[PDB]
Design a protein around this ligand. Structure first.
Ligand code: FAD
Ligand code: FAD
Ligand code: FTK
Ligand code: FTK
Lengths: 461, 461
């Protein structure tokens, strides 16, 4: 926490760095070191808030020279706690939030510290968008490096499927460009390979015109769980790419649109949207809403920016979280029953057992085209425990691990961006052997000393 | 646009500036010089995209030494076209979008180029907010310096009512902090006096906790205008601060929630929200939704960030705009009829005649406490023509001027941030004589040469 540093290499860093430095003695240190996963309580020797690419070069080089463990932070959403370290340096990108958008080229260049909501605001000024995650204050950086999925993904692919280049700072302090035509081996690896290869300071995306979206959210009783889940699974198998429909098993929020009868009881929350014409969307959504008897139905026609901002309306931000996630190639009636049993046990009002259906454009990309594994598995399930009181940690964590073990014969792979702090050992199985090995080769080339290891780490071959 | 610059002056600027320059021969120049108001077609000698406070110091000094007319650009929303100039320099802040939020202090520091949606994203990560306008890609900078109102204003005031300090670069290249206790004269003047005093590079705000908001929008036939507008004005006179209710008279958008037979015909779109508990909001919104026969009702409980992203769901971004706006102290039956007559003539599908009710917290601040005038007028009307085809300019512009002139006996003052490119002469009546004199005094002190004059301009002394 107070390691001895070399005064000469500290002063050279300071001279070369235009951003802000936050030391352990500083008033803002305890807030600056907090990340969204509040179970993670670590104490860096230094937080370096970078403001440009040359800042990130100076910070990488200073870390390498001084032997400080490197954490990189974009939006601080790491479910595994990777964006903070004990006794090392946090290369904190959160002030590097600039976005340039060309309407004529349908292109955006976003800095590596952007939040999604900043990005979506900027592109939507021109009625443009590209796929990203569903919660606005997530970081672009970590989300994209792992793949990135959300409402636009069935239609337009993963975030990475719209990424045309990056600017990246490597472990040796060099600044590279990677694209299809420049360092393409690195360009393959960053599209799914996390922060293993360097600090991405700029991302360039192709964009799509996305106008108003018909959206619906409704809640179903768990008494109708099997019918509603089976309807969802069957429907999604043949659904237009334009339809996205997700199920969140959770206690019913105390909202005025729901009867007070249901508040605080486990329910299915179904969220759906039509990426396309809203009149068509109204027809499509009406056709799926009666999977069970709907309660607390909200339907609206939203700019895409508002769809992105919608998830989720609650009164309190959860402090502590723990997640267990995997993909499924099929969701059987037996797995459905398992999901429903484990959902009925949910204790916290912030916890959700999520059932997502990807496929569509995501699955049309060939498997070997990027480092993102599992494109062909259309289901994702995430036991997303969240709560407030640290004395409850063992109970919440146990719930998520029990549900995972019960589902484990159905599950395959894992999204690197849903891994928890204990899941370092899941990397090889997440990627599979052929991808894991190709990534190790890229690692050997670009980060042979594994300078960047606070991630779902790929050691160099 | 191709002026002769001094090589020593230019070189000095180059050495001190770390942002991006855009020259007239560059491929991105025509896109970079476009502003939201597409009727404004100007060709600067240089666009300087600043990335830091020192960048702005360098651009200001360069402009002063070179005699280049200065445009300052935040989000580019100027109804008057002030953020681009022929032959001068645009000090372009749009890459200065960083925001730091302290949850524990309930404070945000935001750079002068931020978009609202970026700010709201950042504060909402903590369930915090402060008031700002209702269209997410508006710039923070110009909106705040003229006062800044939106959904949170009846409860929490203008943006400026939550401002605690600014960092500002003045005409002589100096960097100052202004606050209640530091350069307080300047701090008075920036709260409502526009960009007249310098380039604001950072704004610091107090924040509030703002959880889910109950929201409604519904459309009434314009045949019910008399009763709807009467209900609105009478209800708002005694309404809780928590209620905000605005009327947009427009052609009905072709949305699936509306019957096809109302598409494209004159209606009143009413939008309302309760800033407070959502069960209470449901009861309050239900009580006002029958001002006329409601059609196309949308009711939702939204995160405040989604409320901010909502305005407005349309499929096309209007290229050309023209606004005429004023305040009213009261809204008589005869003014009501005048508005309704003028609204029945609307031609473009993007044009709206807006009727806002402010009051609440905005009117509880003493009139002399900031440079914002007209606090005690609760009504704002804005004839906001918007269209696509340049051959239609004379027609749309006439509609707006005609409605304004018909209302002018009822109107007082004017919001500087709704002024059109032809309204330079409205500055003294907008502020009133005492405020305008005090502002000229502050101007003589901080901008004695009127270097910053692309704004609703206050000449010194
Ligand atoms: C509430 C919430 C909702 C989410 N929803 C979705 C969703 O809808 N879809 C989805 O796909 N994912 C989603 N996620 C998961 C998310 O993709 C991961 O948590 C992601 O890693 C977050 O990125 P970040 O920059 O915010 O996180 P951080 O904790 O800052 O970083 C995560 C990892 O990326 C690295 N990193 C970050 N920025 C850079 C960079 N610029 N260059 C190099 N390395 C970098 C870090 O070193 C770390 O290894 C969500 C997360 C949260 C917490
Ligand atoms: C679609 C739309 C919706 C709007 N809705 C609302 C609303 O709900 N509420 C409301 O109050 N207003 C609203 N407005 C009006 C708005 O407040 C003004 O248009 C505002 O001036 C825009 O600021 P900007 O930075 O985007 O514009 P710009 O055109 O970049 O700047 C406008 C003025 O401010 C100066 N300037 C900008 N940034 C700075 C800075 N950092 N320091 C010094 N000078 C600066 C410029 O020199 C210029 O004089 C809206 C505008 C638009 C176009
Ligand atoms: O739902 C998500 C995951 C998701 O990406 C998604 C959700 C709906 C539609 C498309 C994609 C965010 C979330 O709450 C999580 F906890 F899982 F992280
Ligand atoms: O009509 C508005 C709305 C506005 O400021 C407002 C709207 C609702 C509540 C409080 C304030 C401004 C705007 O976005 C426009 F450009 F059209 F003028």
């Amino acid at each position: 926490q107070f390691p001895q540093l070399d005064p000469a290499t500290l002063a050279a860093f300071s001279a070369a760095f235009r951003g802000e430095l936050i030391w352990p003695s500083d008033a803002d240190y305890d807030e600056a070191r907090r990340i969204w996963n509040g179970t993670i309580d670590r104490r860096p020797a230094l937080i370096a808030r970078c403001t440009s690419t040359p800042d990130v070069v100076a910070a990488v080089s200073f870390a390498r020279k001084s032997g400080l463990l490197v954490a990189v932070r974009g939006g601080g959403h790491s479910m595994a706690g990777h964006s903070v370290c004990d006794g090392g340096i946090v290369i904190d990108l959160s002030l590097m939030n600039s976005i340039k958008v060309s309407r004529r080229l349908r292109r955006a260049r976003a800095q590596g510290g952007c939040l999604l909501g900043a990005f979506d605001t900027a592109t939507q000024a021109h009625m443009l968008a590209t796929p990203a995650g569903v919660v606005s204050h997530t970081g672009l950086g970590g989300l994209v490096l792992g793949g990135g999925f959300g409402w636009l993904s069935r239609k337009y692919g993963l975030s990475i499927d719209n990424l045309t280049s990056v600017e990246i700072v490597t472990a040796d302090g060099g600044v590279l460009t990677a694209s299809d035509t420049e360092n393409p081996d690195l360009f393959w690896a960053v599209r799914g390979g996390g922060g293993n290869f360097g600090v991405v300071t700029a991302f360039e995306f192709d964009l799509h015109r996305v106008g108003p979206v018909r959206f619906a959210s409704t809640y179903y009783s768990l008494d109708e769980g099997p019918q509603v889940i089976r309807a969802w699974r069957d429907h999604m198998a043949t659904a237009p790419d334009e339809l996205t429909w997700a199920l969140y098993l959770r206690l019913a929020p105390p909202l005025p649109e729901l009867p007070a009868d249901m508040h605080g009881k486990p329910v299915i929350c179904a969220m759906s949207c039509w990426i396309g014409d809203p009149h068509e969307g109204e027809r499509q959504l009406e056709s799926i809403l009666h999977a069970g008897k709907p309660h607390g139905l909200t339907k609206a026609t939203l700019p895409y920016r508002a769809l992105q901002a919608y998830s989720f309306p609650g009164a309190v931000v959860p402090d502590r979280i723990y997640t267990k996630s995997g993909y499924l190639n099929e969701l059987s009636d037996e797995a459905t029953d398992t999901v429903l049993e484990h959902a009925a046990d949910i204790a916290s009002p912030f916890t959700q057992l999520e059932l997502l259906y990807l496929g569509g454009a995501v699955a049309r990309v060939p498997d070997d085209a990027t480092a993102y594994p599992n494109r062909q598995s259309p289901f994702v399930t995430n036991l997303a425990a969240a709560w407030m009181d640290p004395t409850e940690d063992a109970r919440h964590t146990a719930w998520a691990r029990e549900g995972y073990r019960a589902l484990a014969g159905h599950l395959s792979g894992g999204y690197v961006n849903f891994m928890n702090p204990g899941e370092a050992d899941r990397t090889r199985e997440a990627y599979g052997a052929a991808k894991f090995e190709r990534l190790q080769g890229v690692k050997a080339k670009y980060d042979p000393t594994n300078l960047f290891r606070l991630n779902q780490n790929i050691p160099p071959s």
